Amino acid sequence: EVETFAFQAEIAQLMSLIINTFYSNKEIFLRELISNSSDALDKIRYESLTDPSKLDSGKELHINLIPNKQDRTLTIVDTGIGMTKADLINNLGTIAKSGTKAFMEALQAGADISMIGQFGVGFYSAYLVAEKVTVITKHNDDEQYAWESSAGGSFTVRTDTGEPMGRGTKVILHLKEDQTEYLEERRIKEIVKKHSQFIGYPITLFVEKE
């Protein structure tokens, strides 16, 4: 079963703004997704402080960056707290309606798109570079699910019978045809060093067979 949901009007508006506004500084999408991963890792760490069994689904707390030039995908994997099905449907665990409001009011007051993460909706900066985003997630309290959207007002949720993850979130960015620089090792390294050099979890940039 694939279930299809409509985005709330404000989130649809946010994604259309991200897709259609001319804005050259697209590289901040990776900082925002790594920041979300770090937040998710913080959350499972915090829960584990009083219930160590929370880590039975995986003790390692890390972020992996996986480019694939054949599929034209960049995948960000974390072993953080993950998302339940209900979290996925609630705009990926965000307060996206109120966050979008505050982001829009800030843009009116002289903010720019790079400040999106201050308003809790940094995930949607993925659409600066991706035509489609697939999110695979596993939370301790639910089964493994796949969320997907190519924007256009709707997203799908289905149970994921793919590779079991144990716990965490994978964001698969199906890149736009003119955004393949974000598959290049030196480009990813540059962005991580520029924007994410002090993240408190190991970030491993995977290599590809040439």
Next chain:
Amino acid sequence: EVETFAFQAEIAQLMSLIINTFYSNKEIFLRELISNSSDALDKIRYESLTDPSKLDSGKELHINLIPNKQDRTLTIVDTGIGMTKADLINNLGTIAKSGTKAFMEALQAGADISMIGQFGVGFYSAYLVAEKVTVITKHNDDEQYAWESSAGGSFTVRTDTGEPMGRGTKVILHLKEDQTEYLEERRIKEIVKKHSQFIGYPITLFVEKE
């Protein structure tokens, strides 16, 4: 009953660093505390999206800044999710052990104290300006508690029979004798505009009788 707890060695180390390092840019303490309040407000908002009764303890989501020159206190009040007794004992709901580690490693790599909030331990920047901090908190799942510390390696927790808060957190900064500029209306306004101008909750700066 007043219970006294020792800080973990790493947190005690962090507070001693904050208290003893020469660092003139102390004003960032307010940005960090407002940011924590905004995070707590985001959390109760998110919970309320699927269980509206979470707001039975108070529908208003806001931040108040209350200077008191007679007591020499600056109080930051929020109606966010609040903290249970267990949260208070776990370093105010932070991952302070791992966060302190990452903050220290960043300081070695060219970070400065103003970046403390990136590592989840921004609360402790309160000790840039306060000799003592009192935290009154009420979470939906627990009773109202008061946490207190003048650093020096220990903190206390007691049930609070003061004014019932409903839900949220009050951080009371008992300011150092040479830090009373942070009670001045124009100074607080300047800092809020400089560092917190896009927070998505109303921030109300209370006035005093002269």
